[PDB]
Amino acid sequence: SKNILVLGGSGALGAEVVKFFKSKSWNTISIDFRENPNADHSFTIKDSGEEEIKSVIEKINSKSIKVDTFVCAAGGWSGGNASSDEFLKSVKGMIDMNLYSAFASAHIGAKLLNQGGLFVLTGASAALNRTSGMIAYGATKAATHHIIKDLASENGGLPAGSTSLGILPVTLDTPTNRKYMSDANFDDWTPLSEVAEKLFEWSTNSDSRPTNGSLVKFETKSKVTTWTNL
Amino acid sequence: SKNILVLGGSGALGAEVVKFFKSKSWNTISIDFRENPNADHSFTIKDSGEEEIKSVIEKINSKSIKVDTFVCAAGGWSGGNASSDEFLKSVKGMIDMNLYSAFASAHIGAKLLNQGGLFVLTGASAALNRTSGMIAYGATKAATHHIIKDLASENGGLPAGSTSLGILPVTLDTPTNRKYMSDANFDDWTPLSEVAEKLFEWSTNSDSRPTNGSLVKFETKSKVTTWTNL
C-alpha cells in the first residue's frame, strides 16, 4: 500500500496529483497553507520556515508512514524586471513561494522518503533561458533546478536508490491561467491530469524514470504533450 | 568625480574595494549592516527587505548621486546537505545573506546606475557545478548567476549601455577562508586587492570589459591569477 506526499497539495496541480493517486488507491498526503479535504491525510503549515517544517515532519513520523513518491507542486508567479514598481515585492513572494518550498522539499525528502523512492520538484522551462520580465521568478526557479540536480548526488541527503527529478512546465491548464490569459490557445497548455499521469508512470514503474537529476521539460502543442529530458 | 557604490561595503572584500577605489580618487559609498567609516558615504540597513532597500535608495537619491560602478560584495557561506542537522538554518542564512542582497542590487542598480555603468555581483565558481555538501549556498549562488544574466538584457531594467558581470572566485583570501581552510597554501588564494584592481580596470577602460552577462571565474595558483570569462 504505497504512499505519496504532495507539498502544495491544495493548489491546482497539487490537488490534481492528489485526486489522481487516490483514484489509483495510493494513500495521499498533502501539505499546504490551506486544507485539502480530499486527501487521506492533510496538513496545514503557517510558513515554509524551519519550525513549521520540523513540526510537520514530526506529525507524519507519528503516523509511522514513509513515502514512496514525493512531489512539490508548491510555487507561484509574479512579474517584473529590476526597475519595475512591483520588483521588490515580487522578490519576497517568489522566494517564499518557490525557493523556501523547494528547500523544505529537500528536507522532507531526506527524512520521509523511502529507499528507492521518487522525489520530484516542479521547476519552470522559462527559467532555462533569460527571464528579464520576471527576474525573481526566473532566479528562484533556476535555484529549484540547481537543488534537483544536487539531490541526485550520492551525498545529497536523499536515501539510497531514490531518483531526484525536475518537471518543467512551459504552461499548465489552470482556471487561473484561463482567467488571466483568456486570449490564449488553451490547446497549447498541459492538462493537469497528464502531469499526474506521468507522475504515476514514474511512481509505479522504476524502469520508466529518466536518469537521476534530469530536468524534464514538457510542452503541449495542439493537445499533444512532449516530454524532453534535459 | 566618479562614484562607486558597494553593497556589503563593510565585509572583507567590500572594504578592500572601497579602500582601493578611494586611493584612485573615486568617491566611495557603502551599504552594509554596520558602517564603513573609511568610505566617503556609509549607510546602514536593518535588513535586506523591501522597505529598507527603498529607504537607502531614497536616501542616496535625495542626495543627488548616481553611480558609475556598483559592486555587491555582500553574502555569506554555510554548509550542509539535505539531511544534516544544520540544513534548515543554512537555508534561511543563505537566502538572507546571498539571495536577498543580489535581488537588492538589481533594484539599486536600476535606480542609481549611470548610463554606461558597471554592475557587478559576486557569484561562486563552485555553483557552476554540483554543490551537494552545501546545497543552500550552491542554489542561492545559482540564482545570483541567473540574475546577472537577466540584468545583461536590455529589458532587464538597468540603464542603457551598462554591463552586468558576475565575479566567481575559486578562493579569495578572506578571514572566512582563513578560518575554514587554514591548512591551505595561501599563495593559491586571490588577494582581495587583485579583485579591486580588476574592478577598477573594468570601471575605467570600458574596452577591457567582458561580454555583457559573463560569469567571470578567477583562480590563483602560486600567486599568478587567471581570469576566465564564461
Ligand SMILES: NC(=O)c1ccc[n+]([C@@H]2O[C@H](COP(=O)([O-])OP(=O)(O)OC[C@H]3O[C@@H](n4cnc5c(N)ncnc54)[C@H](O)[C@@H]3O)[C@@H](O)[C@H]2O)c1
Ligand atoms: N501554472 C502554470 O502555468 C505553471 C508554469 C510553470 C511552472 N509552474 C509551477 O507549477 C507549480 C504549481 O502550479 P499551480 O498552477 O498548481 O499553482 P497554484 O498557485 O494553483 O498552487 C500552488 C500552491 O502552493 C502553495 N504554496 C506557495 N508557497 C508555498 C510554500 N512556501 N510552502 C508550501 N506551499 C506553498 C500555495 O498556497 C498554493 O496552494 C508551481 O511550482 C508553479 O511555479 C506553473
Ligand SMILES: NC(=O)c1ccc[n+]([C@@H]2O[C@H](COP(=O)([O-])OP(=O)(O)OC[C@H]3O[C@@H](n4cnc5c(N)ncnc54)[C@H](O)[C@@H]3O)[C@@H](O)[C@H]2O)c1
Ligand atoms: N572565496 C570563495 O570560495 C568564494 C566563492 C564565491 C563567493 N564568495 C563570496 O565572497 C563574498 C564576500 O566575502 P567576504 O569574505 O568579504 O565576507 P564577509 O562576511 O567579510 O562580508 C560580507 C558582508 O556582507 C554583509 N551582508 C550580508 N548580507 C547582506 C545583505 N543581505 N545586504 C547587505 N549586506 C549584507 C555582511 O554584513 C558583511 O559585511 C560573499 O558574496 C561570499 O558569498 C567567496
